[PDB]
């Protein structure tokens, strides 16, 4: 009778409170912390009245109506959507469209924080959720609850040398948080830009690889439930998403003998740890003597009849059977082969002799398999030779010359993340490299697509990002150097002195040099590799000398006007 009471009872007060704070901070990313805490405490107090009596006034209203009415209580330059003037369901759609993937937003001393922690523990932990959620408005909300548990545990151990304990733990946590956020942003862009059918096919392929002994009916059931979870989370329905994720983990753990031999330990863990464990479980062993793919999908007399009589079941069986046999292929490579198979049946089954028309369809798959295999072989060699920083700089000059209109901060950020694929995947044997590397590159290229959509400047980025979700990686790799680009004239404001540049950490030092290298390539787009190195080495020596001089500002200004 009351949906706010239903979710309060299922989730418990503590997780309900946290999920409503996450929801409000993802919808209004520029609103101060104290204003959101007010609204949350009021929603919670109301929810308790509906638990006491599901029939009290207002207790039958939808969650969208209740939350939106709260948000609407607290310079446009001529352009601003007015979400609070709308009725539901258009009002919720308006809030979703204001989410900002690159918001204009800004860690005290170790002893300071521990002082705040034992002072006001609850307030301390709510500030953590608020700052993550407002910077990452598509973070998977149930996973953010797991990060919060671990963030509390680090303080309730280390505050008891504190900086030698706490700071490495907090570093591993923002590292894994950044990678979690980018992985979920790909699921939401998949569902919203390319549709439910495209997300379902991605899930059929990934779960058939990971659960190869499961029957097709069992994989299809898991795919329907997983699709409902992510549709809710990406549409702002966070209390519903968390409750359905919990139910899916309970189903899997009661049905292990029909799904996978790898789930035992995952399924004995506490509640948030269990779902996190299942999502990252290793692939099960493939059954030994599976019948050939060619017999069911190429040689059978019934191919055209099965495609006409039950199109979605027949093509979903093709994808399940191919994926469970090929854990060594990326997901995007399997989705490419299924699209090629369907296109070939549409043409052949409408003509005279189909059996001979599609008899060689597996020959068309070989160029598609070989192109990614060769790419990853070569970058792992280059990585082994150069190391991560110089591998990054190689990828940065390459991508700047493909799309030089893109902004310098976006080129540095994407290029640094493309180069992390070396440390992440090149240690695996040949066979495990392709899923690791090509599915990671899909996540990083989606980052480039959504950071560029806000302010489009490169027609070639817009085309590669809109044409085909599965073909994005081969589309970017195929771009040649841009010959139409006009060299950027020299500015100088990039290089104004700031005191921090003489006391940089190693990571900060690399980011500055990679920024200078992108600007140099934009200014001199046809200088050679050796010419770029000589200029870069000379400017870095200039910074070195002026950071030692008796008057730093004067040296930078005096020697800078000479350069």
Ligand X SMILES: N[C@@H](Cc1cc(I)c(Oc2cc(I)c(O)c(I)c2)c(I)c1)C(=O)O
What burial class does residue 480 get, using C-beta atoms within 10 Å of its C-beta: 0-12 exposed, 13-18 middle, 19+ buried? exposed
For residue 524 the two structure tokens come to 């001199």
How does DSSP assign 287-305, residue by residue?
PTTPPPHHIIIII-TTHHH
Site for ligand X contains 375 (CB under 6 A): yes
What burial class does residue 551 get, using C-beta atoms within 10 Å of its C-beta: 0-12 exposed, 13-18 middle, 19+ buried? exposed
What burial class does residue 256 get, using C-beta atoms within 10 Å of its C-beta: 0-12 exposed, 13-18 middle, 19+ buried? middle
Alpha helix positions (H), 195-310: 196-210, 216-234, 238-254, 271-279, 293-294, 303-309
- Secondary structure in 3-state letters for 367-419: HHHHHHHHHHHHHHHHHHHHCHHHHHHHHHHHHHHHCCCCCHHHHHHHHHHHH
Tally of CA atoms within 13 A in the half-sphere of 546 that contains its CB: 20
> Contacting ligand X (CB under 6 A), which of 125, 349, 382, 386?
382
Give min distance, CB of 466 to ligand X, in A.
19
Q: Is 523 annotated as a binding residue?
A: no
Site for ligand X contains 378 (CB under 6 A): yes
Site for ligand X contains 505 (CB under 6 A): no
Site for ligand X contains 503 (CB under 6 A): no
8 A C-beta contact, residue 334 and residue 319: yes
Based on CB atoms, which residue is closest to ligand X, 219 or 441?
441
User: Which region, judged by CB under 6 A, interacts with ligand X, from 177-185, 296-304, 321-329, 490-498?
Assistant: 490-498
Give min distance, CB of 47 to ligand X, in A.
47
Based on CB atoms, which residue is closest to ligand X, 61 or 512?
512
8 A C-beta contact, residue 274 and residue 251: no
Q: What is the DSSP letter of 258?
A: G
Based on CB atoms, which residue is closest to ligand X, 26 or 417?
417
> Contacting ligand X (CB under 6 A), which of 441, 448, 449, 470?
441
Q: Is 370 annotated as a binding residue?
A: no
8 A C-beta contact, residue 347 and residue 246: no
Which residue, among 384, 399, 397, 387, has the nearest Cα to 533 in the 3D structure?
397
For residue 217 the two structure tokens come to 């009916």
As a 3-state breakdown, the chain gives helix, strand, coil percent values, each rounded to 5, of 70, 0, 30
8 A C-beta contact, residue 266 and residue 282: no
Which residue, among 15, 18, 41, 37, has the nearest Cα to 28 in the 3D structure?
37
User: Which region, judged by CB under 6 A, interacts with ligand X, from 105-113, 119-127, 310-318, 538-546?
Assistant: 538-546
8 A C-beta contact, residue 306 and residue 314: yes
Give min distance, CB of 405 to ligand X, in A.
16
Based on CB atoms, which residue is closest to ligand X, 180 or 379?
379
Based on CB atoms, which residue is closest to ligand X, 44 or 515?
515
8 A C-beta contact, residue 327 and residue 286: yes
Which residue, among 127, 85, 103, 126, has the nearest Cα to 28 in the 3D structure?
103
Q: Is 244 annotated as a binding residue?
A: no
Give min distance, CB of 190 to ligand X, in A.
20
Based on CB atoms, which residue is closest to ligand X, 220 or 393?
393
How big is the site for ligand X, counted in residues (CB under 6 A)?
Answer: 32
Based on CB atoms, which residue is closest to ligand X, 322 or 329?
329
Based on CB atoms, which residue is closest to ligand X, 461 or 516?
516
Distance (Å, rounded) from C-alpha 541 to C-alpha 536? 9
Distance (Å, rounded) from C-alpha 4 to C-alpha 61? 8
Q: Is 75 annotated as a binding residue?
A: no
> Contacting ligand X (CB under 6 A), which of 283, 471, 510, 515?
515
> Contacting ligand X (CB under 6 A), which of 197, 366, 498, 507?
498
Distance (Å, rounded) from C-alpha 520 to C-alpha 536? 8
Give min distance, CB of 511 to ligand X, in A.
8
User: Which region, judged by CB under 6 A, interacts with ligand X, from 139-147, 229-237, 304-312, 371-379?
Assistant: 371-379
Q: Is 247 annotated as a binding residue?
A: yes
User: Which region, judged by CB under 6 A, interacts with ligand X, from 44-52, 66-74, 228-236, 510-518?
Assistant: 510-518
User: Which region, judged by CB under 6 A, interacts with ligand X, from 115-123, 316-324, 447-455, 536-544?
Assistant: 536-544
Residue 58 region by backbone torsions, left for phi larger than 0, else alpha for psi between -120 and 50, else beta: left
Report how far apart, in Å, the C-alpha atoms of 352 and of each of 344, 347, 356 are: 14, 11, 10
Give min distance, CB of 481 to ligand X, in A.
11
Give min distance, CB of 72 to ligand X, in A.
39
Site for ligand X contains 536 (CB under 6 A): yes
> Contacting ligand X (CB under 6 A), which of 512, 525, 552, 559?
512
Report how far apart, in Å, the C-alpha atoms of 479 and of each of 156, 257, 310, 504, 514 are: 51, 48, 39, 35, 22
Q: Is 235 annotated as a binding residue?
A: yes
Give min distance, CB of 559 to ligand X, in A.
10
Window 463-482: residues binding ligand X (CB under 6 A): 476-477
> Contacting ligand X (CB under 6 A), which of 33, 539, 552, 559?
539
> Contacting ligand X (CB under 6 A), which of 16, 139, 383, 495?
495
Give min distance, CB of 365 to ligand X, in A.
21
For residue 270 the two structure tokens come to 């506490």
Question: Which positions from 391 to 430 touch ligand X by CB under 6 A, shown as an x/- string?
Answer: ---xx--x-------------------x------------
- Mark the binding-site residues for Ca(2+), compressed into ranges: 3, 10, 232, 237, 240, 243, 247
Which positions lie near ligand X, rule CB under 6 A?
A: 375, 378-379, 382, 394-395, 398, 418, 441, 476-477, 490, 494-496, 498, 501, 504, 509, 512-513, 515-516, 519-520, 523, 535-536, 539-540, 543, 563
- Mark the binding-site residues, compressed into ranges: 3, 10, 64, 228, 232, 235, 237, 240, 243, 247
- Mark the binding-site residues for Zn(2+), compressed into ranges: 64, 235, 237
- Mark the binding-site residues for (4Z,15Z)-bilirubin IXalpha, compressed into ranges: 228
């Amino acid at each position: 009778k009351s949906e706010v009471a239903h979710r309060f009872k299922d989730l418990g007060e503590e997780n309900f409170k946290a999920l409503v704070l996450i929801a409000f901070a993802q919808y209004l990313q520029q609103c101060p912390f104290e204003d959101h805490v007010k609204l949350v405490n009021e929603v919670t107090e109301f929810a308790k009245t509906c638990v006491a009596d599901e029939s009290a006034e207002n207790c039958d209203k939808s969650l969208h109506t209740l939350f939106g009415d709260k948000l609407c209580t607290v310079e446009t330059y001529g352009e601003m959507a007015d979400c609070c003037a709308k009725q539901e369901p258009e009002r919720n759609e308006c809030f979703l469209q204001h989410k900002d993937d690159n918001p204009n937003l800004p860690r005290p001393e170790v002893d300071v924080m521990c002082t705040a922690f034992h002072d006001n523990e609850e307030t301390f932990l709510k500030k953590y959720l608020y700052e993550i959620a407002r910077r990452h408005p598509y973070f998977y909300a149930p996973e953010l609850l797991f990060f919060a548990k671990r963030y509390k545990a680090a303080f309730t151990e280390c505050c008891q040398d504190k900086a030698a304990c706490l700071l490495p733990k907090l570093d591993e946590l923002r590292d894994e948080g950044k990678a979690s956020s980018a992985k979920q942003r790909l699921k939401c862009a998949s569902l919203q830009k390319f549709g439910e059918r495209a997300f379902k096919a991605w899930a059929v392929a990934r779960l058939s690889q990971r659960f190869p002994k499961a029957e097709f009916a069992e994989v299809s059931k898991l795919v329907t439930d997983l699709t409902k979870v992510h549709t809710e989370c990406c549409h702002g329905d966070l209390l519903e998403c968390a409750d359905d994720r919990a139910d899916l983990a309970k189903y899997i753990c009661e049905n292990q003998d029909s799904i996978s031999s790898k789930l035992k330990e995952c399924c004995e863990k506490p509640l948030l740890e269990k779902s996190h464990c299942i999502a990252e479980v290793e692939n099960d062993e493939m059954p030994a003597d599976l019948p050939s793919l060619a017999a069911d999908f190429v040689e059978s007399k019934d191919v055209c009849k099965n495609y006409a009589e039950a199109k979605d079941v027949f093509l979903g069986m093709f994808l399940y059977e191919y994926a469970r046999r090929h854990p060594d292929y990326s997901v995007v490579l399997l989705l490419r082969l299924a699209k090629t198979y369907e296109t070939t049946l549409e043409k052949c089954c409408a003509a005279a002799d189909p059996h001979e028309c599609y008899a060689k369809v597996f020959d068309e798959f070989k160029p598609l398999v070989e192109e990614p295999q060769n790419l990853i072989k070569q970058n792992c060699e280059l990585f082994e030779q150069l190391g991560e920083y110089k591998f990054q700089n190689a990828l940065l000059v390459r991508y700047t010359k493909k799309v030089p209109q893109v902004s310098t901060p976006t080129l540095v950020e994407v290029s640094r993340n493309l180069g992390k694929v070396g440390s992440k995947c090149c240690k695996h044997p040949e066979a495990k490299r392709m899923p690791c590397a090509e599915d990671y590159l899909s996540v990083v290229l989606n980052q480039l697509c959504v950071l560029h959509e806000k302010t489009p400047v490169s027609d070639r980025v817009t085309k590669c990002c809109t044409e085909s979700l599965v073909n994005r990686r081969p589309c970017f790799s195929a771009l040649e150097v841009d010959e139409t680009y006009v060299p950027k004239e020299f500015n100088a404001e990039t290089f104004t002195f700031h005191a921090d540049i003489c006391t940089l950490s190693e990571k900060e030092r690399q980011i500055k040099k990679q920024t200078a290298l992108v600007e140099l390539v934009k200014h001199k787009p046809k200088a050679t590799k050796e010419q770029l190195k000589a200029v870069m080495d000379d400017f870095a020596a200039f910074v070195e000398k002026c950071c030692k001089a008796d008057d730093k500002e004067t040296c930078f200004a005096e020697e800078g006007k000479k350069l």
